[PDB]
């Protein structure tokens, strides 16, 4: 039943989140963006005047309702310099409100679509993502939605992983996952073929994000999502537009990400040692790429 399923779920969440209403300490709720699960606002801490982000998600308007536990749990258990800080989670009416840090630098998509990144900047982003993924993969947690949209920046050029709503977990008992979850263009071929998959799907997705940072778009981006998925399924791994300008350490790096067989694909822990990541620039080198500085 709909009621039995909803009410029980709301009550479970109520216990999982913090009690009360964040409006008791927050002013100026203003929408700044929308996603898949819900909308995102900025708010003001009444006492200090400091800005925070608030993600509001309707319980009644989710495809897989149970995935909303991720929105709270992941940022709780996995505090990391490359992971978005979560302060509090609340239940307001039929909505889940997650209070987290505001990333003033915006999404990586904003940069990737407008300007071209040098290898120093690309390596900085890759290192940040992989450091975050290695901690997650070590605990069997798969992100499942790695893309430039899921990557956020500070004003000083630091890089953080976001959007943990699609996370699944694997363990000794649950070796692989089977669910079709993620964004079509970034999806791994084994996941599209509906085969049992592990954390290796994030590694492939990262490779697609590398193609983003170099070329501006994922492969088959002009194609319809459903049609483009079958293309990733049947074809050989996608290549960069022109390799004449890219360094061999970047080629070598991407060759470890975009492997069709997940068993031959490199793990996050392995890639953290790859020579390409040593070119990673300081946070300062990322700053010129941002909106205010274009």
């Amino acid at each position: 039943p709909q009621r039995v399923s909803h009410e029980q779920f709301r009550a479970a969440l109520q216990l999982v989140v913090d009690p009360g209403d964040p409006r008791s300490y927050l002013d100026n709720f203003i929408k700044i963006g929308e996603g898949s699960t819900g909308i995102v606002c900025i708010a003001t801490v009444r006492s200090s005047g400091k800005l925070v982000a608030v993600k509001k998600m309707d319980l009644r308007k989710q495809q897989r309702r149970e995935l909303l536990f991720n929105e709270v749990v992941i940022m709780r258990d996995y505090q990391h310099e490359n992971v978005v800080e979560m302060y509090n989670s609340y239940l307001v009416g039929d909505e889940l409100w997650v209070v987290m840090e505001f990333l003033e630098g915006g999404a990586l998509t904003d940069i990737v679509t407008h300007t071209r990144m040098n290898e120093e900047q690309i390596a900085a982003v890759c290192l940040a993502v992989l450091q975050a993924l290695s901690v997650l993969h070590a605990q069997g947690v798969i992100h499942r939605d790695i893309k430039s949209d899921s990557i956020l920046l500070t004003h000083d050029g630091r890089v953080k992983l976001s959007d943990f709503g699609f996370c699944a977990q694997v363990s000794k008992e649950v070796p692989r996952r089977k669910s079709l979850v993620g964004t079509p263009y970034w999806m791994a071929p084994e996941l599209i073929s509906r085969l049992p998959y592990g954390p290796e799907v994030d590694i492939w997705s990262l490779g697609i994000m590398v193609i983003e940072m170099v070329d501006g778009e994922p492969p088959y981006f002009n194609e319809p999502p459903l049609k483009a998925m079958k293309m990733i399924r049947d074809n050989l791994p996608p290549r960069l537009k022109n390799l004449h300008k890219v360094s061999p350490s970047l080629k070598g790096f991407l060759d470890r990400l975009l492997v069709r067989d997940p068993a031959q694909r490199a793990t996050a822990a392995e890639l953290l040692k790859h020579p390409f990541l040593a070119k990673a620039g300081p946070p300062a080198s990322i700053v010129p790429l941002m909106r205010q500085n274009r």
Binding site: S36, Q63, L67, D149, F166, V181, G182, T183, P184
Partner: peptide, 7 residues
């Protein structure tokens, strides 16, 4: 921007 797929 493309939207994610579930199920």
């Amino acid at each position: 921007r493309p939207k994610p797929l579930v199920d």
